[PDB]
């Protein structure tokens, strides 16, 4: 309070915006790797605005769905821009979030006191996967039918209530009009849960502030968010919109499959069923197990060892700048997630059955050889001392 007024940004109507978006204290040495988080909140707003206008011309019926998407591309004013922004915009939303996650692994941003910020973001990554999968079915092409068949039948290897799971998810005995109608209703709903879980994920970071490239206690050198990290975030929103415009105007079909331009026929099978590029690493782990019930049970330990990183303790050094051995393991895990994506679009044959079984093992040896440096490393100040 004071006795009379002052700057209007310090009034109750704009206090929550002032103290969290203008005057918020920030470490002064943050690099451009701290810019991909506001870039991911712009990619979520683009998908909501473009999809609300796409849904004014789409019909969720098996006799009318493929022809409603060609009606947008051909007869609606600017309608080809509305579709290409939405199909390619889901690839931009996954490039930005994948570079966000690998920042937090290099600088160990999951550590104390920031465990709830990590665990709220593993829930966000799960809501993004369900939303993109369920929305790839509405165009109703040959890859929108034979991809919803391969994934929803994978719940038929669960013990002995699982044959009642798949025919309740389907609404019948196969993928058909009962399945296309309920996949549309859930697809309008799940982006609005994703919005409320992103505002909650930001209230958990504004309780302790941000980490920095050195990993240290930083409260002695801090500046404000406006104008310093607003004008260098604006350099990032313009470099993004150039890169996004070479995918809409000059190459709008490079990141897709041609088989989704054939209308859906349940009598023949396509020769090769391959997902979008951003589902290729978990598709190669899922096909690496020669048992099917052990394939669903290798996807759930991917999201268990992610949710259980910030609860191992003894590591006082955070940043990989001062840690020369864990830094070399980071570049050796990134080479493995790019090799698991290559395997996930190859035939299931030799030699890709051995080269697709070792990288699922190397991927799970990253989360077990982290805590052993949490033991051998804490005896460094008693040995190297001078």
């Amino acid at each position: 309070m004071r006795n009379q007024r002052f700057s209007l940004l310090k009034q109750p109507i704009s206090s929550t915006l002032n103290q969290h978006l203008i005057d918020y204290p920030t470490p002064s040495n943050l690099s451009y790797w701290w810019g991909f988080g506001s870039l991911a909140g712009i990619c979520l707003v683009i998908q909501i605005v473009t999809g609300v206008f796409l849904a004014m011309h789409y019909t969720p019926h098996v006799d009318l769905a493929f022809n409603s998407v060609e009606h947008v591309m051909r007869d609606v004013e600017g309608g080809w821009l509305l579709r290409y922004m939405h199909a390619n915009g889901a690839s931009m939303f996954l490039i930005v979030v994948h570079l966000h996650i690998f920042r937090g692994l290099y600088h160990a941003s999951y550590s104390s006191p920031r465990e709830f910020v990590r665990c709220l973001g593993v829930v966000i990554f799960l809501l993004m996967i369900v939303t993109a999968f369920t929305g790839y079915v509405p165009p109703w092409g040959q890859m929108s039918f034979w991809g919803a068949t391969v994934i929803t039948s994978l719940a038929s290897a669960i013990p002995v209530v699982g044959d009642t799971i798949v025919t309740w998810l389907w609404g019948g005995f196969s993928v058909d009009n009962a399945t296309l109608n309920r996949f549309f209703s859930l697809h309008h709903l799940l982006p609005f849960i994703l919005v409320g879980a992103s505002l909650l994920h930001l209230a958990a970071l504004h309780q302790y502030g941000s980490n920095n490239p050195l990993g240290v206690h930083s409260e002695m050198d801090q500046i404000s968010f406006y104008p310093y990290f607003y004008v260098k975030d604006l350099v990032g929103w313009v470099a993004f919109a150039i890169f996004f415009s070479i995918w809409i105007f000059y190459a709008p079909n490079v990141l897709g499959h041609p088989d989704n331009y054939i209308p859906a026929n349940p009598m023949p099978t396509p020769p090769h069923i391959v997902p979008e590029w951003y589902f290729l690493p978990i598709h190669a782990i899922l096909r690496s197990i020669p048992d099917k019930s052990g394939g669903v049970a290798a996807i759930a330990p991917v999201f268990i060892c992610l949710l259980a990183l910030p609860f191992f303790k003894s590591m006082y050094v955070r940043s990989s700048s001062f840690r020369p051995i864990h830094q070399g393991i980071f570049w050796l895990l990134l080479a493995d997630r790019l090799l698991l994506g290559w395997i996930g679009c190859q035939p299931v044959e030799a030699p890709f059955v051995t080269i697709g079984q070792i990288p699922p093992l190397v991927f799970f040896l990253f989360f077990a050889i982290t805590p052993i440096p949490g033991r051998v490393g804490r005896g460094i100040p008693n040995s190297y001392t001078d």
């Binding site: 013990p159 002995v160 209530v161 009642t164």
Partner: peptide
């Protein structure tokens, strides 16, 4: 004391089974 803590706490595991089949009758399993 501390035994009676768990000697209570494992019957809410079972108050929850009187409850877990109370509405759904999960049948096949």
């Amino acid at each position: 004391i501390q035994p009676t803590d768990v000697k209570a706490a494992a019957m809410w595991g079972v108050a929850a089974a009187t409850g877990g089949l109370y509405l759904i009758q999960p049948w096949g399993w």
